[PDB]
Write a protein that binds this DNA or RNA. Structure first.
Lengths: 76, 94, 328, 109, 84, 99, 87, 97, 94, 112, 76
DNA sequence: ATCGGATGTATATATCTGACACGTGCCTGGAGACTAGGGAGTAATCCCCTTGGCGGTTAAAACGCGGGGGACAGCGCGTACGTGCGTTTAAGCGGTGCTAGAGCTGTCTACGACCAATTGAGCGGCCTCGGCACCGGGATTCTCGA
DNA sequence: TCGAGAATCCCGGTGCCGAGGCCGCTCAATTGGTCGTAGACAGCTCTAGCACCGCTTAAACGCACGTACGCGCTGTCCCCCGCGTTTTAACCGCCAAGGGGATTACTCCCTAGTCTCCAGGCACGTGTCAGATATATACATCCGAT
């Protein structure tokens, strides 16, 4: 199915997803397709701060829907 | 993750009780982070070599009072002992 | 053979007993006599014309035969001024104020004739509220010229020693009263003995002193604490009373009112304590610092002068800064 | 199990009395640490860090910056000659020196 | 290996001149520009040799930031403001 | 005709001008090269985490200023103004580091 | 109490030949005339930073004697170690 | 006709005479009175076990003698020989007191 | 009675293995009695502030070797490490 | 379990290795003390005290006495630059100084 | 009854005793009559080293019999 | 450069007496043997941090140069400081009483180490934003030429 | 001794990006327990400090000259500051690659904490020798005079 990834500067990228795979896998594909670090990104949709071990369907975001992208400083 | 701890939150609370408008840049907090952990090295490090000369085994609330009047000079002496003795008298009646 | 110092006004002349008691090599009953004639010739100019006759110059204090001729003309010249004031010449007023150099001429002949051991009144140990150092005469002559005390002020010294700080401050200007206490026996036995002579010696010059009360009253008692609150100008001797004394002394200073003075040795604050919350032990939330004059004749233990610190107590500095954080 | 109470609040202080009490048992400064001791140690750090910052910002007020840069510390610590003898070997990073010209180096008319 | 040699010309002739102005001097004579490099090379022999010996003992192979403060302290020149 | 100043007044600007700023005065990258070659004859590979090589630059001005502050007093004491090679070694020895 | 201890004329102990005897050990040759009123000011300072801790150490055990084992423990934290007395 | 040495070469026997010996230079009893009149200022009564006064004397030489070996060097520095009051005030200052 | 102990018996045994004829006055033994208890203060006092910078809890036979090459200068360094390492190699085969 | 092999004998040393191992635990230098360490520590006090006593004993045979007076221990520290930096802040009791005159103070032979 | 106290230097002192009192009491009387310290003395009779809490009859030494005196260094 | 006359300094013999160097019975801290625990070591992974690389820019560095003033070398000049000596004044040896105070020895209540339950202050991590960095005016404020 | 030529603070704009403010947490941290080892302390002992006397002399105190030695100054030259023009590297982003950082279980080998057996270091006393003392020779050194 389809996903929208909204950036906070006003841009979206449309991507090929499976809801059965984890969101860590699609954020790895976000790394391979844009270069955003896995530690640095965080994706939210309607007050729902995602976790990497969970999948897309586990937080009930459907087809042709958008995840909002915001960044945090990585640290160690 | 493993956390790590400093003194930087408490020193900022002190600053409201002197100038309640100003601020401190994050570069300068590292001085005060490295300022208390030098005096606290000297003071408690001085009581430990004082427990031997009376050959005891308990650093109590009195050998801090002996070491304070040694390390700090005479001008800041006569206010420092007051600022602790006033505090302990609150702590007994508690 | 007894030596008699007659009074120039005609009231309570001096009766020194025989023989002369010796205390030390610098202040006896004879060394105060050479400074006695010099001060009655300053106030009354006619007496210097009579003292030059039948009086030799080469006299000293270790010879009584050179002393009897000094008191022979002195006993003769006082009867010549009593027959003169009853005629057409007006006598001296009994209400004037002397200079600061004649004030030391009081506390020589009041002190030395009252105590037989001044070094026993030097009984002091540190870390105790009883150390009375070398607070001389000229430390006290400055404390009247800085601010002028009127008749609603007060002057209490919890710890006056012999009270010689009170015998001068109650001799330049006035208050409601003046006071000075000391608890233990011999540091107050030579304090009430001062009260047996300053009530006699000030009337010998003809000058009026301000009112005082030296006694043996308790310095840590409850009732005199609000008398410090009734006192404007505070003199407590915090040279070396101690850290265990200064804060309970600051438990006495708390109940006071505005405009009051604290004449004390130590700087109660480092000269810039503003309204912000750093006062839980000191009394300097309601005062600022005023230095007294540095000393030049009295030496300390190290070799530095002993300066005192006036503090004009102001709760005006209280109320004018609660609302500075709210405007606008 | 009544209502909780922190040990710093009974002192009326700001520095952590609890954290210091964890430090003296982990420096091997002795075998046993008395109960009344780290109350007293936490008081003297309150006073001795109040003397820096009250003397810091006053030197910062004269230079018209509402923050405190480390330039504003070195010009304050070497003012009181009492505080100078305690830190006579510390060189502050980015510190600089006090304004200072010797007497001969002034020009002579 | 890049054989380093003749590297003492880093501390150059105006740089000693600018450092002297902080100390408040007015006329520098011509012979100081040799002698300062003699002193400055001596002072860095002592610090780094203590700094290596700590980080030899920890058996890691990078001189940390704390491995200068923890060697400057024992000489009697502590240094605040580096995570101390 | 372009007006030269009298000598000894360019300097008295720079004493008034370097004593007010807090910047470090030695070049950064040539100072890194001096540190590595003295580090070369021990252990043969020293990585030098970049905060430390900056941190070591603070301890030269902690030492060269403190030497030039006191060697000036050695020269002024003997009625001369120019510092000299016989002004360092006197000021280093009384400090007690030349053994 | 009754023993009089106002012996304030006591700076004359470090007297004019003694200091002249001292500086010969350092090896000087001609001593100027104004050093005597200055070296006496030096020595009274350095004793005033040694006794003033030596009392503080011997006050701490609650006894009334600065013992000979406590002068050594005060000179150590200033930087002048002293051997030769069991320290 | 009396034997008078030229000035300068009398002291240079004493430098040969005192640098060989380890006698305590200052008199014992005048120094022993001085210690009590400094304890007099901030203690009520002290007793001073007598080996301490034999110990405190030792640190009134290694502070004085170590000064005079250093204050000589600055006097040579200004092409002079006699040490001065403004030489100690320099040689104390670089030491950091 | 309570006994008290020093190092004076052992230092005299060292003297036979250098000059087997001489002697030491009893005044000078107090220097060597107060000489070992100053170095032993510094050396073991240096390993204790070295166990923290690697955050361990056991002062072993290696941090003495680190502290020795710090305190003593370079000339006496290269003989001191030999004189211990030769000793420990005897102590393992024992 | 035969008889009495002390650790100094099992090492080849002179300083008491058992005594040092008590004087670490009762000084509070760490929590757990090593076992191989005070063997090593007893060598460094040996090699140092063998270095000092050899030096003064050399000078003591030239001043023609045969004991070692504390004046002689002063003369065998300040005259060896291996050691003078190690004890540069020590004042030996009854010490004395080194024979030391500066240059210019020597009597100039202007026309001798 | 009678007691003999032999000293090791060859002297005896004859004393008035009770066998019912402890030997600590008669050694206190030895202190009052000769000055010998209680800690320093020890009295033996035929291989019997006495104890202070016991009496004279408890170790079976009879009338007109001798106790041998020897000394040990006191210490602390 | 040659001396004679005057100090002092080492070399010298001879002698005493306080302090070392061996001797000894001795109580206790060594050592041996032992098990029962947890620290440190050995292995192995993952992502920040250093390293070498490369154009461009330009502030900074050499480099010749052309005057003045400061190091400095010489010298007269009057003074403070050393030599030496003739009265003086406590320091040094030693003897004698007094005793407050140090060092133990037990009998001892008050205490902090210790363990394991139930929370809140610290802690990250975002963050909107406003002191603090900048250029072009703008004064005073300066100095070397007459 | 005044009129131009600079560095200079002051005023305003105008950008950015570091602090102050916000939460939702994993956890030290109190609370509430008590067990055992201290330090508190009352006797009590007595060794060492204080004070005081007198006696003896070797160290401290002022004349009395004198000469070296500090100190101004003067004159000479000469080595370093002040600016110019040329000219080499520091510098900033941007570039990409690898070694060694920290963490993560996982054993397993160690060092406390024990018991008993005793030789080591003490505290003893103890007749003797290097070493201080002291009277004498000696050469080593200064210095008036030549």
């Amino acid at each position: 199915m389809q996903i929208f990834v909204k950036t906070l500067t006003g841009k979206t990228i449309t991507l090929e997803v499976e809801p059965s795979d984890t969101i860590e896998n699609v954020k790895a594909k976000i790394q391979d397709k844009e270069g955003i670090p896995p530690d640095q990104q965080r994706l939210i949709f309607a007050g729902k701060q995602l976790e990497d071990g969970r999948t897309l369907s586990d937080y009930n975001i459907q087809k042709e829907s958008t995840l909002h992208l915001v960044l945090r400083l990585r640290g160690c | 993750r493993s956390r790590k701890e400093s003194y930087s939150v408490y020193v900022y609370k002190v600053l409201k009780q002197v100038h309640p408008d100003t601020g401190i840049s994050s570069k300068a907090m590292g001085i005060m982070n490295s300022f208390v952990n030098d005096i606290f090295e000297r003071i408690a490090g001085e009581a430990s070599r004082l427990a031997h000369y009376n050959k005891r085994s308990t650093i109590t609330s009195r050998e801090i009072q002996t070491a304070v009047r040694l390390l700090l000079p005479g001008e800041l002496a006569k206010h420092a002992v007051s600022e602790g003795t006033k505090a302990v008298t609150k702590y007994t009646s508690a | 053979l007894e030596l008699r110092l007659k009074s120039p006004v005609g009231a309570e002349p001096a009766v020194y007993p025989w023989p002369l008691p010796v205390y030390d090599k610098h202040h006896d009953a004879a060394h105060e006599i050479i400074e006695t004639i010099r001060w009655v010739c300053e106030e009354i100019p006619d007496l210097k014309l009579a003292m030059e006759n039948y009086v030799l110059i080469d006299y000293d204090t270790k010879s009584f035969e050179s002393m009897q001729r000094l008191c022979d003309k002195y006993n003769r010249a006082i009867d010549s001024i009593h027959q003169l004031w009853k005629g057409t010449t007006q006598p001296m007023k009994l209400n004037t104020r002397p200079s600061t150099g004649l004030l030391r001429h009081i506390l020589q002949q009041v002190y030395n004739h009252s105590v037989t051991d001044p070094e026993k009144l030097n009984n002091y140990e540190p870390f105790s509220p009883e150390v009375y150092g070398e607070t001389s005469f000229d430390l006290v002559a400055q404390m009247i010229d800085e601010i002028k005390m009127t008749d609603d002020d007060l002057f209490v010294d919890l710890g006056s020693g012999v009270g010689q700080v009170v015998l001068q401050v109650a001799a330049a200007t006035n208050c409601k009263h003046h006071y000075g206490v000391e608890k233990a026996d011999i540091p107050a036995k030579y304090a009430e003995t001062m009260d047996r002579e300053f009530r006699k010696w000030m009337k010998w010059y003809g000058k009026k002193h301000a009112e005082y009360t030296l006694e043996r009253g308790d310095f840590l008692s409850e009732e005199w604490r609000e008398r410090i609150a009734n006192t404007s100008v505070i003199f407590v001797n915090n040279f070396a009373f101690g850290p265990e004394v200064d804060h309970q002394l600051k438990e006495r200073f708390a109940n006071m009112k505005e405009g009051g003075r604290i004449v004390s040795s130590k700087p109660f604050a480092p000269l810039n304590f503003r309204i912000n919350s750093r006062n839980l032990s000191d009394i300097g939330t309601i005062m600022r610092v005023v230095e007294l004059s540095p000393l030049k004749g009295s030496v300390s233990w190290t070799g530095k002068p002993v300066s005192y610190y006036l503090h004009t107590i102001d709760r005006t500095i209280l109320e004018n800064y609660f609302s500075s954080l709210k405007n606008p | 199990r009544a209502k909780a109470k922190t040990r710093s609040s009974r002192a009326g202080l700001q520095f952590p009395v609890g954290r210091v009490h964890r430090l003296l048992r982990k420096g091997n400064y002795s075998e046993r640490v008395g109960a009344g001791a780290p109350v007293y140690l936490a008081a003297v750090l309150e006073y001795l860090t109040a003397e820096i910052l009250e003397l810091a910002g006053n030197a910062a007020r004269d230079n018209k910056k509402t923050r405190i840069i480390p330039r504003h510390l070195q010009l304050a610590i070497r003012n009181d000659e009492e505080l100078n003898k305690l830190l006579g070997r510390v060189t502050i990073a980015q510190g600089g020196v006090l304004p200072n010209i010797q007497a001969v180096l002034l020009p002579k008319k | 290996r890049k054989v380093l040699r003749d590297n003492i010309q880093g501390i150059t002739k105006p740089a000693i001149r600018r450092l002297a102005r902080r100390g408040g001097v007015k006329r520098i004579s011509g012979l100081i520009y040799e002698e300062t490099r003699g002193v400055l090379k001596v002072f860095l022999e002592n610090v780094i040799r203590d700094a290596v010996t700590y980080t030899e003992h920890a058996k890691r192979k990078t001189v940390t930031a704390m491995d200068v403060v923890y060697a400057l302290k024992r000489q009697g020149r502590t240094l605040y403001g580096f995570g101390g | 005709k372009p007006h030269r100043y009298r000598p000894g007044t360019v300097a008295l600007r720079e004493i008034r001008r370097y004593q007010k700023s807090t910047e470090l005065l030695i070049r950064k990258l040539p100072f890194q090269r001096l540190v590595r070659e003295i580090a070369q004859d021990f252990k043969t590979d020293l990585r030098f985490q970049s905060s430390a090589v900056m941190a070591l630059q603070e301890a030269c001005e902690a030492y060269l200023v403190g030497l030039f502050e006191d060697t000036n007093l050695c020269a002024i004491h003997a009625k001369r103004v120019t510092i000299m090679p016989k002004d360092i070694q006197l000021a280093r020895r009384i400090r007690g580091e030349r053994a």
